[PDB]
Design a binder for this molecule. Structure first.
Ligand code: HG
Ligand code: HG
Ligand code: HG
Ligand code: HG
Ligand code: HG
Ligand code: HG
Ligand code: HG
Ligand code: HG
Ligand code: HG
Ligand code: HG
Ligand code: HG
Ligand code: HG
Ligand code: NA
Lengths: 337, 52, 399
């Protein structure tokens, strides 16, 4: 039985030849929807997504190394890209021209656009143990922050910032006047950190984050909860029904309903309610890991990429296995009950 | 020794369920031989060794 | 492909419309005036949003080409012995209801077919009101402000702002203003009214020009229960160059239940009562003519509401009175509550009663007239069926 697309979701055309590392949907300032993917074949691709479900390959840029993160500028004219080639790039979509904007001493694992009242920069996190900020014109960073280890996962919702490193490092950042350290948090997970996602309260204000480890477990953590011993919790996920424990590769919050999606090495995506503390859906098992997922600006679209994630090392890598991006209509299923 | 030259073997453990179960951890970085590196670090150095 | 099999039915999506089928024998009970009624356990919102996912949109009616159509329940051409009163589905919360005319004591499983198609009417650009010339003398004190302006896509418009004074004889709200630009035809883009209670509701609006080419315009508004002496008025008009397909003598409000669709909601002018099983060829005040070839007219069909007013369909012809044929099928009497929807007038084009539709043929026939296939012709959208089976708890821990 063919289990490449058990949910039978929309399949993006011209999918990355190599494994897909990262996914990022255009901001609400563009009309329509555009999806960016980086891959381990060094490229970054753009597809327009219509409301009909069709996808049109738009353009493509290349690094000299695997692309590990992507994101957009607030206004939608630029795509930023973070590569294993120790560089980051700003892709001007009108001109289809990319230029370097960042230099690291190791691979760049995370990239994020910060629009603040008094400044706009891109934040890069690297395995060289720094967090840097570029103004997109100068070769010198506006700011360099020292991390406790190599940058694994990173998430930004102005004015909050969450960074996970190796050895379960977890730092929350304040961004209001200048980026600055706010709190180092003793980790709620006992295993390696892989992904992180900030969520908002009812005011649309960042109040906490979801953190995912390699150990089939996600932590839900509020920054200023009324009752920490009760309001911060973890939960098990991406396990079989002897139990197999898989890695959580990606977390994403529905921008409107505040529910969340997790995707894992087990080849399944799951939908949750961190408030009701319930599970809304678990997909059927794809025949390879789900490496990255992403919601569009209004949460009508859930993108999730089917690619090997090295979770079993090189022996289980089949380079002739094809990679897919699936699009799924999420407007109804991510609403709470 | 970079990359993933040591054979993958899911570590054994124990957990509780809601009752008492045993687990296998299907992630190469759970093995002690790899627990100081991430999946992407391991894969990049396998890629630089043309170990695809 | 995406079906909804729930409580003896199955709403499937062909790609441009819905096809519905009974899954069990339907016994005809309490037959009145040749018809029986039957409730379905599905609403229009279940089919367009809650039980199906159409493309990547939050609702089928949110799609580019479906955001301009009228959802229309219509019988199938492959149902010999079964007729259905067609009707617009202009709400999403009321369960779908059928009106079946049959001689059969029962309808076998899978034989009661019907469609929900998406009707795209004739565009608003083919219709406009007409300003007739009269003998109007200038008022000694001018009453309002008239500013030329651009509207729509860089088109010539006219912003009139003026108080309306109530005539004591007619009750109509009138005003005389001096238009800076001359025009024969027009469309009404909005009417903002400001009384003593504030925002105020309008039934019709006419504009007359004078026959001495002076540029004097007489505004007349017929209102709903507004008893005020003066209304403050703001009216934006589109000025229409050259003839359109339909020419009206008076403007009507946009449809409240189908916003941004081009159709006329027909309300009950005079309050009347209907005994069960009784018909009524109600005559509406509306009239129109042609300004210019396939033929053009209006479909007169019913709407959807919790207590449906069933309408035997008719074609409304240029120069002919608008009759709305009501057919009481309820067990109680029906009084025609004022300002509520009786029928819709949908403008279509056709080539030459019993409105049926063929799924394979892409053919929709009203009587002997053939509705233009383009009207119900939309692109195929791949939609999936939403299940929502289980919501089990997290198995969660704390520190
Ligand atoms: Hg693009
Ligand atoms: Hg971003
Ligand atoms: Hg900065
Ligand atoms: Hg995203
Ligand atoms: Hg069906
Ligand atoms: Hg008109
Ligand atoms: Hg005027
Ligand atoms: Hg009038
Ligand atoms: Hg009435
Ligand atoms: Hg017919
Ligand atoms: Hg027909
Ligand atoms: Hg007809
Ligand atoms: Na009178």
């Amino acid at each position: 039985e063919d289990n490449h697309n058990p949910m039978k979701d929309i399949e993006v055309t011209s999918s990355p030849d190599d494994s897909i590392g990262c996914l990022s949907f255009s901001p609400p300032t563009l009309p329509g929807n555009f999806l960016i993917a980086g891959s381990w074949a060094n490229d970054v691709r753009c597809w327009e997504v219509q409301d009909s479900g069709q996808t049109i390959p738009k353009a493509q840029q290349m690094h000299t190394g695997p692309v590990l993160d992507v994101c957009w500028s607030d206004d939608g004219s630029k795509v930023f890209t973070a590569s294993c080639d120790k560089t980051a790039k700003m892709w001007d979509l009108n001109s289809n021209q990319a230029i370097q904007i960042a230099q690291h001493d190791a691979p760049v694992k995370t990239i994020h656009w910060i629009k603040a009242p008094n400044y706009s920069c891109v934040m890069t996190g690297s395995w060289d143990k720094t967090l840097k900020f570029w103004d997109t014109r100068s070769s010198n960073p506006m700011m360099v922050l020292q991390l406790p280890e190599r940058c694994y996962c990173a998430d930004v919702i102005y004015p909050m910032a969450v960074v996970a490193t190796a050895e379960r490092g977890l730092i929350v950042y304040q961004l209001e006047n200048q980026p600055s350290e706010f709190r180092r948090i003793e980790s709620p997970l006992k295993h390696q950190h892989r992904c992180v996602a900030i969520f908002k309260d009812k005011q649309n204000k960042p109040t906490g984050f979801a953190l995912g480890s390699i150990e089939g477990r996600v932590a839900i953590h509020y920054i200023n909860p009324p009752n920490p011993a009760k309001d911060n919790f973890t939960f098990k996920c991406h396990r079989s029904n002897p139990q197999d424990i898989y890695a959580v590769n990606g977390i994403a919050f529905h921008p409107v309903h505040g529910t969340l999606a997790t995707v894992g090495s087990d080849g399944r995506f799951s939908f949750w309610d961190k408030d009701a503390r319930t599970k809304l859906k678990t997909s059927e098992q794809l025949d390879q890991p789900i490496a990255a997922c992403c919601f569009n600006h209004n949460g009508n679209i859930f993108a999730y990429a089917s690619s090997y994630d090295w979770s079993k090392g090189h022996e289980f890598y089949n380079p002739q296995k094809k990679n897919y991006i699936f699009l799924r209509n999420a407007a109804e299923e991510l609403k709470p009950r | 020794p970079t990359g993933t030259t040591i054979k993958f073997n899911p570590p054994t453990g124990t957990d509780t369920m809601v009752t008492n179960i045993s687990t296998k951890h299907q992630c190469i970085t759970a093995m002690k031989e790899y627990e100081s590196k991430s999946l992407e670090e391991l894969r990049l150095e396998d890629y630089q060794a043309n170990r695809k | 492909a995406p079906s909804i099999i729930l409580n003896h039915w199955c709403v499937t999506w062909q790609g441009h419309h819905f096809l519905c089928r009974n899954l069990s024998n339907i016994k005809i009970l309490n037959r009145r005036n040749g018809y029986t009624t039957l409730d379905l356990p599905l609403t229009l919102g279940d089919l367009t949003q809650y039980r199906l996912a159409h493309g990547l949109s939050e609702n089928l009616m949110a799609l580019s080409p479906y955001s301009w159509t009228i959802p229309f329940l219509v019988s199938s051409s492959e149902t010999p012995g079964i007729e259905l009163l067609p009707k617009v589905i202009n709400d999403f919360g009321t369960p779908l209801s059928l009106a079946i005319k049959t001689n059969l004591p029962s309808i076998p499983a899978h034989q009661l077919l019907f469609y929900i198609i998406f009707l795209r009417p004739s565009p608003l650009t083919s219709m406009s009101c007409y300003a007739r010339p009269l003998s109007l003398a200038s008022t000694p004190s001018t009453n309002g402000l008239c500013q030329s302006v651009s509207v729509l896509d860089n088109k010539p418009g006219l912003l009139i702002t003026t108080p309306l004074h109530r005539d004591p004889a007619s009750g109509k709200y009138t005003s005389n203003v001096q238009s800076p630009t001359t025009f024969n035809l027009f469309r009404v883009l909005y009417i903002k009214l400001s009384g003593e209670e504030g925002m105020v509701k309008v039934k019709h609006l006419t504009i007359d020009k004078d026959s001495l080419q002076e540029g004097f315009l007489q505004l007349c508004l017929n209102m709903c229960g507004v008893s005020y002496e003066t209304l403050q008025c703001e009216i934006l008009l589109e000025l229409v160059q050259g003839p359109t397909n339909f020419i009206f003598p008076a403007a009507f409000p946009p449809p409240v239940s189908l916003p941004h669709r081009n159709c006329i909601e027909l309300t009950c002018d005079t309050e009347r009562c209907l005994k069960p099983g009784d018909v009524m060829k109600l005559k509406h005040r509306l009239l129109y003519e042609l300004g210019q070839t396939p033929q053009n007219a209006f479909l007169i069909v019913g709407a959807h509401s919790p207590e449906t007013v069933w309408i035997s369909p008719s074609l409304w012809l240029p120069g002919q009175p608008l009759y709305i044929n009501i057919i009481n099928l309820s067990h109680k009497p029906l009084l025609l509550s004022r300002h509520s929807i009786l029928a819709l007038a949908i403008p279509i084009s056709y080539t030459r009663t019993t409105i049926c539709y063929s799924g394979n043929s892409r053919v929709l026939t009203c009587g002997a007239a053939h509705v233009l296939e383009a009207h119900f012709k939309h692109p195929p959208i791949t939609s999936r069926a939403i299940t929502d089976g289980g919501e089990s708890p997290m198995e969660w821990q704390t520190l």
